[PDB]
Amino acid sequence: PRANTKIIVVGGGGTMGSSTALHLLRAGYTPSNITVLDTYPIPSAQSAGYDLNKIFGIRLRNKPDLQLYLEALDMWKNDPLFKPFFHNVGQMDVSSTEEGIKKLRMRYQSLLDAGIGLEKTNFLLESEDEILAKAPHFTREQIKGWKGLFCGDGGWLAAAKAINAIGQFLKEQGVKFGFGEAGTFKKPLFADADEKTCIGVETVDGTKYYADKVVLAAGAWSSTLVDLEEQCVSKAWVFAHIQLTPAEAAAYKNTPVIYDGDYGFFIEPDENGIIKVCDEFPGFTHFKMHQPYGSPVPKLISVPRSHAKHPTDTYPHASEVTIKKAINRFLPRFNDKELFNRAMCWCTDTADANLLVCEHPRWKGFYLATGDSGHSFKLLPNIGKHVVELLEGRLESVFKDAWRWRPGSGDALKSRRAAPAKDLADMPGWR
Ligand SMILES: *Cc1cc2c(cc1C)nc1c(=O)[nH]c(=O)nc-1n2C[C@H](O)[C@H](O)[C@H](O)COP(=O)(O)OP(=O)(O)OC[C@H]1O[C@@H](n2cnc3c(N)ncnc32)[C@H](O)[C@@H]1O
């Protein structure tokens, strides 16, 4: 029974972890029977969801994407917990190359082919007046030859504030927590030597926790903690910040997310006039030597870098150039603004960009909730519901099949992206 079942959530201070913790409580699980274990207190300061904002937008690259999007949209708009952090300003994809424009038109036609009537809230913009109509901060000279795709259900998400909102609820309900070395996963605990029955986890300080079921939602650290057999390759993307005065930020109030595949994107300034700018690239890996549990031999795994141990860290010099090019494209008036809060954000890719959400093949009672593939923060409100369904053996096949244990199903180093990720050991400047 739910009331008498104990669950351990590793990485419960992150996106998929806190979501799982939330839906356990909603399902009627006893709060004191739930134990969240994360290196950092929720919201985890090293979590990929520990950001000013993320983008919410429709994307149909896999079979479960449509239902996951519709589910999250419904909750981002109506759920009293998540609603205050969704800003529905829309999103616009632009391009001036013939291949980029070609790609816009195909993405638009892709939405139509779903047959649910997405053409009602998604429009192609073939004129310059149509573009300026939805994004008046551009100039007519700037957007000469641009074509646009406007998705109206889009917008951005107050990321860290949303995870923090879940955390406040968890603590207020009486969920037990473990931080620092007492919250840092080391290995699972087993009943016998055959290791076919998991009964808990041990942290790096030696502390042991016992429960009926364990959930591993360690994000980009998952493949370093347990042996995922190269199903997940962790990569880092980059962003920077610029600050506008209230008078400068005025022309961008309620502005749609602007995106161009050949440059990157930016989001409207927040409460403090801060604009974030990402670029567009396959990501950076960081292979460092590590022994994940389940592997008999120290493998070389892409491990996220610790900002705590490396304070001077920003990002490679190549990133500085591409971020400045993005700024020159979208916000040329601010080309003299200073960049600050340069940082790297870590995700983990699967081969087909589907999630990795499944019970461990051998470790019965041990479950995996990772494989975010750098596009899953949008699933914060609803992903935890399906993880619970997995634990109770009620996950529908459309999700269970795509999220299945699938080693040797392709190369996650390249994934669905344009190129294999380069490593930070070959990029100068970030250290
Ligand atoms: C990097 C990035 C990602 C991103 C994005 C922009 C950037 C720069 N923009 C997005 C967007 O616009 N829209 C969107 O939908 N997603 C976007 N993303 C991706 C998103 O951030 C990730 O997909 C997602 O956040 C990852 O989820 P996950 O739950 O997997 O990740 P996490 O929050 O990092 O969770 C990890 C937690 O695990 C804890 N941890 C790590 N190790 C341990 C150990 N050993 N023991 C206990 N806990 C551990 C971490 O501390 C963290 O709390």
Author numbering: 3 to 433
Authors' text:
Therefore, we initially attempted to determine the crystal structure of AnFPOX-15 for detailed rational design. The refined models comprised 431 residues for a protein molecule in an asymmetric unit, although the enzyme consisted of 438 residues. All amino acid residues (P3-R433), except for the N-terminal residues (M1 and A2), could be assigned to the 2Fo-Fc map; however, the electron-density map for residues S297-I303 and H309-P313 were relatively ambiguous. The structure of AnFPOX-15 resembled the known structures of other FPOX enzymes. Recently, the crystal structures of group I FPOX, namely Eupenicillium terrenum FPOX (EtFPOX)17 and Phaeosphaeria nodorum FPOX (PnFPOX), were reported. They both shared high amino acid sequence identity with AnFPOX-15 as well as showed quite low rmsd value compared with AnFPOX-15 (0.80 Å and 1.12 Å, respectively), suggesting their structural similarity. No significant structural difference was observed between the ligand-free AnFPOX-15 and AnFPOX-15/FSA (rmsd = 0.46 Å for 429 Cα atoms).
